[PDB]
Design a protein around this ligand. Sequence first.
Ligand code: HEM
Ligand SMILES: *[C@@H]1O[C@H](CO)[C@@H](O[C@@H]2O[C@H](CO)[C@@H](O[C@@H]3O[C@H](CO)[C@@H](O)[C@H](O)[C@@H]3O)[C@H](O)[C@H]2NC(C)=O)[C@H](O)[C@H]1NC(C)=O
Ligand SMILES: *[C@H]1O[C@H](CO)[C@@H](O)[C@H](O)[C@@H]1O[C@H]1O[C@H](CO)[C@@H](O)[C@H](O)[C@@H]1O
Ligand SMILES: *[C@@H]1O[C@H](CO)[C@@H](O)[C@H](O)[C@H]1NC(C)=O
Ligand SMILES: *[C@@H]1O[C@H](CO)[C@@H](O)[C@H](O)[C@H]1NC(C)=O
Ligand SMILES: *[C@H]1O[C@H](CO)[C@@H](O)[C@H](O)[C@@H]1O
Ligand SMILES: *[C@H]1O[C@H](CO)[C@@H](O)[C@H](O)[C@@H]1O
Ligand SMILES: *[C@H]1O[C@H](CO)[C@@H](O)[C@H](O)[C@@H]1O
Ligand SMILES: *[C@H]1O[C@H](CO)[C@@H](O)[C@H](O)[C@@H]1O
Ligand SMILES: *[C@H]1O[C@H](CO)[C@@H](O)[C@H](O)[C@@H]1O
Ligand SMILES: *[C@H]1O[C@H](CO)[C@@H](O)[C@H](O)[C@@H]1O
Ligand SMILES: *[C@H]1O[C@H](CO)[C@@H](O)[C@H](O)[C@@H]1O
Ligand SMILES: *[C@H]1O[C@H](CO)[C@@H](O)[C@H](O)[C@@H]1O
Ligand SMILES: *[C@H]1O[C@H](CO)[C@@H](O)[C@H](O)[C@@H]1O
Ligand SMILES: *[C@H]1O[C@H](CO)[C@@H](O)[C@H](O)[C@@H]1O
Ligand SMILES: *[C@H]1O[C@H](CO)[C@@H](O)[C@H](O)[C@@H]1O
Ligand SMILES: [Mn+2]
Length: 299
Amino acid sequence: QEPGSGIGYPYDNNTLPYVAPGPTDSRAPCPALNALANHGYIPHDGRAISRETLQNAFLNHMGIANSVIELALTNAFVVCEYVTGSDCGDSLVNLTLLAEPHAFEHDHSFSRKDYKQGVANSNDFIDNRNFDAETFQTSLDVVAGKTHFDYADMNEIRLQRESLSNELDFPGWFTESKPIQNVESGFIFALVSDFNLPDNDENPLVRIDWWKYWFTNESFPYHLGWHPPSPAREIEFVTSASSAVLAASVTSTPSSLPSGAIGPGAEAVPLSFASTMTPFLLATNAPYYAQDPTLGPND
Ligand code: HEM
Ligand SMILES: *[C@@H]1O[C@H](CO)[C@@H](O[C@@H]2O[C@H](CO)[C@@H](O[C@@H]3O[C@H](CO)[C@@H](O)[C@H](O)[C@@H]3O)[C@H](O)[C@H]2NC(C)=O)[C@H](O)[C@H]1NC(C)=O
Ligand SMILES: *[C@H]1O[C@H](CO)[C@@H](O)[C@H](O)[C@@H]1O[C@H]1O[C@H](CO)[C@@H](O)[C@H](O)[C@@H]1O
Ligand SMILES: *[C@@H]1O[C@H](CO)[C@@H](O)[C@H](O)[C@H]1NC(C)=O
Ligand SMILES: *[C@@H]1O[C@H](CO)[C@@H](O)[C@H](O)[C@H]1NC(C)=O
Ligand SMILES: *[C@H]1O[C@H](CO)[C@@H](O)[C@H](O)[C@@H]1O
Ligand SMILES: *[C@H]1O[C@H](CO)[C@@H](O)[C@H](O)[C@@H]1O
Ligand SMILES: *[C@H]1O[C@H](CO)[C@@H](O)[C@H](O)[C@@H]1O
Ligand SMILES: *[C@H]1O[C@H](CO)[C@@H](O)[C@H](O)[C@@H]1O
Ligand SMILES: *[C@H]1O[C@H](CO)[C@@H](O)[C@H](O)[C@@H]1O
Ligand SMILES: *[C@H]1O[C@H](CO)[C@@H](O)[C@H](O)[C@@H]1O
Ligand SMILES: *[C@H]1O[C@H](CO)[C@@H](O)[C@H](O)[C@@H]1O
Ligand SMILES: *[C@H]1O[C@H](CO)[C@@H](O)[C@H](O)[C@@H]1O
Ligand SMILES: *[C@H]1O[C@H](CO)[C@@H](O)[C@H](O)[C@@H]1O
Ligand SMILES: *[C@H]1O[C@H](CO)[C@@H](O)[C@H](O)[C@@H]1O
Ligand SMILES: *[C@H]1O[C@H](CO)[C@@H](O)[C@H](O)[C@@H]1O
Ligand SMILES: [Mn+2]
């Protein structure tokens, strides 16, 4: 928000306004990075981004401690080298390259289509990067008519997404990614669980309206009473949440799940790509921004 608005106070005492991305700006497949860039906490053009810029933006504007993004930073820079063909040092070339498929970006996302979802032909690909309202509605509808949800519900959401993706993706494309996705499940609990409930830290419940605002608008739900978690969330919360999602008992099983879907997940680890592997072409679509309605500077 505008700095004088005080909308962030006393959790964020140095806010900047929302500015929609323009056609030439670079955006990510990540709703968090996109919100940060839209506010200029990382470059509004989405280019030439250092580790410390990312660390400070998450810590000071989202209540997310450095530990939470340590592996994500490693993997962002691995993917940058893979996509560009050279070491990117400490200047991430852009955010768009993070949508390189079967890498950090993965299938069965909550709010994005898959790279070969619904394609009639094998060499074809689609936008696996921008927010997709229909896809996100498939996640939301698992928890329809509710204001909050728990770990077991999140497990059902990710199972629904895996099912749909396995059914809709071009045969042979679909690749399950439980470890990365369920770190992101933990990220959702870390950011938009309801800290106004007495047992939040131990039994977090996602507030659905906060989640929906964040993802649809790529800005922060201050108007709904959200603020950055204080103290900032740490990696233990995130991986504990990830564990708890996958350990929750499944009471509704979709058909078409890949082998081993129900059960614990491997720890997320650093990515690596063979030097002789050429990257998949990135989708070139302009960055998404909310238009129904468009957002003002304080939204
Ligand atoms: C340097 C830090 C980060 C990097 C490089 C990064 C990168 C990514 C990438 C590549 C994806 C796409 C995965 C996919 O859905 O196919 C993604 C998704 C996601 N990220 Fe980030 N991320 C970072 C930090 C965070 C943080 C701290 C949060 C929130 C606390 C967050 C929340 C999410 C969520 C919830 C998704 C899943 C979106 C969906 O499935 O529709 N990210 N991120
Ligand atoms: C974010 O950065 C990435 C990585 O640099 C950009 O993707 C790359 O964009 C270049 C054009 O600037 C593409 O190069 C072209 O490739 C074709 C096919 O090989 C070649 O014939 C052309 O002469 C040219 O070199 C490159 O393919 C593309 N990389 C991938 C893997 O798709 C991306 O455009 C940047 N996005 C934004 C919004 O800044
Ligand atoms: C991205 O741009 C490429 C050319 O720059 C196209 O060849 C791709 O098909 C892809 O097109 C999509 O996004 C661009 C934005 O640059 C739109 O102009 C197209 O209409 C399409 O949505
Ligand atoms: C915001 O400013 C107030 C008033 O000085 C202060 O009490 C509070 O600790 C500040 N918040 C942060 C995150 O620094
Ligand atoms: C997006 O933000 C606008 C402006 O604050 C708000 O009216 C709208 O409800 C938000 N969208 C969602 C889905 O939360
Ligand atoms: C989540 O999981 C990690 C291991 O991946 C632990 O280090 C953490 O304490 C939490 O249990
Ligand atoms: C790890 O931490 C999470 C968040 O505090 C808990 O919900 C979980 O039960 C485990 O203790
Ligand atoms: C979360 O918890 C599970 C089991 O409780 C662990 O296997 C995982 O490593 C993480 O600590
Ligand atoms: C785990 O527990 C649920 C009930 O919470 C069962 O429906 C499921 O079969 C599994 O035993
Ligand atoms: C069984 O229970 C789980 C968790 O309580 C639900 O998410 C599912 O829809 C079914 O009712
Ligand atoms: C749906 O069905 C699967 C097995 O096909 C169970 O593991 C799950 O708990 C749910 O009953
Ligand atoms: C229980 O929930 C699962 C996962 O969302 C569905 O696939 C199933 O049809 C039932 O509603
Ligand atoms: C989230 O974190 C847990 C604990 O490391 C994993 O088991 C899960 O697969 C996901 O990465
Ligand atoms: C990481 O691991 C891959 C193999 O998965 C190697 O090809 C790469 O050079 C790096 O050691
Ligand atoms: C990268 O580019 C090579 C050709 O240079 C392809 O063979 C490979 O599948 C990938 O598309
Ligand atoms: C986004 O842009 C529209 C005009 O298309 C305005 O009506 C709205 O208030 C916001 O500025
Ligand atoms: Mn994806």
